[PDB]
Amino acid sequence: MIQNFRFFAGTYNVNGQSPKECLRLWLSNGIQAPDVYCVGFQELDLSKEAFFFHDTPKEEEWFKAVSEGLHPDAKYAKVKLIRLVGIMLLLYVKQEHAAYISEVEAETVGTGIMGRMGNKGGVAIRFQFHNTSICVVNSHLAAHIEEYERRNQDYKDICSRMQFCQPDPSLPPLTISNHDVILWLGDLNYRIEELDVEKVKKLIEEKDFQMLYAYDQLKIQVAAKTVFEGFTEGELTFQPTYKYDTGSDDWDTSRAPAWCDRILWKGKNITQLSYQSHMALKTSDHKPVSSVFDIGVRVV
Ligand SMILES: [Ca+2]
Numbered sequence: 001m002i003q004n005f006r007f008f009a010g011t012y013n014v015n016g017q018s019p020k021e022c023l024r025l026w027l028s029n030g031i032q033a034p035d036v037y038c039v040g041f042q043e044l045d046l047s048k049e050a051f052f053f054h055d056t057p058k059e060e061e062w063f064k065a066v067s068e069g070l071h072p073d074a075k076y077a078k079v080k081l082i083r084l085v086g087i088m089l090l091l092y093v094k095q096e097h098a099a100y101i102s103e104v105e106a107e108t109v110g111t112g113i114m115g116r117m118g119n120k121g122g123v124a125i126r127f128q129f130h131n132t133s134i135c136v137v138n139s140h141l142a143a144h145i146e147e148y149e150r151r152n153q154d155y156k157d158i159c160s161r162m163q164f165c166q167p168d169p170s171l172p173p174l175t176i177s178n179h180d181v182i183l184w185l186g187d188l189n190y191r192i193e194e195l196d197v198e199k200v201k202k203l204i205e206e207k208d209f210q211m212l213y214a215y216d217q218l219k220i221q222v223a224a225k226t227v228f229e230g231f232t233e234g235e236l237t238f239q240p241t242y243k244y245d246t247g248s249d250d251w252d253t254s255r256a257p258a259w260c261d262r263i264l265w266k267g268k269n270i271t272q273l274s275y276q277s278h279m280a281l282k283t284s285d286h287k288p289v290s291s292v293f294d295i296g297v298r299v300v
């Protein structure tokens, strides 16, 4: 029997900052309490120290910040936390679902310096929920403005190198694609091309996000089948989420605005209820993005 549960997916590039703001706006702003929360960060800590010895007080800081921000109408249990340098993913479920979560595994893949360090890359948590297999990936891909090939390479390398082991020590490992349900979120860093920074801002003024999409690097590459084969993205009905002046909604361009921050998915029995950014949070040069899904899970 398929029963629907509500999944919240969120991605936020916090530009090396500690949380200054209440996250309720992002994580529980006029939504029903999700059954499951998948919350992704990039650039959690930008220090060389963090890049070097992993430890950083930004982890407890954003964890406290997310937990305080979850929907107040339910109690949530943290299932798993995973981080590679500045890339962190948190998985929470309502306390009443905890017993039905199993085979939780978490892995990381660095795809930055030398094609292997964690300045860029991916982290993932997969698990079983009742009798449905789910994998959630948070990734931070190459930032070069022109050279999207580097993002495609990061994406190809997360897919080929991310391997989850299994209790049975005689079985092959699982890859990201070996799941009934895949959610992929992150600062994917694809930008807008050809169009002038003037036109790109003006298009954003009059809210004509359809025309702009035709020049979005991610749209183009997905159609070219160089990444995200089989994935869907909901219509982008919110303005690009990068790059803003910290503490405001004005632009900064050291580089047109861009839909850096995205959530895609593939699987049967997945319906997307919403796809938003959250302008009111001004702690970072990105805005956070969120999506709620009704996902059908097989319950036996
Ligand atoms: Ca790379």
Ligand SMILES: [Mg+2]
Pocket (backbone or CB within 6 Å): 015, 016, 043, 285
């Ligand atoms: Mg930054």
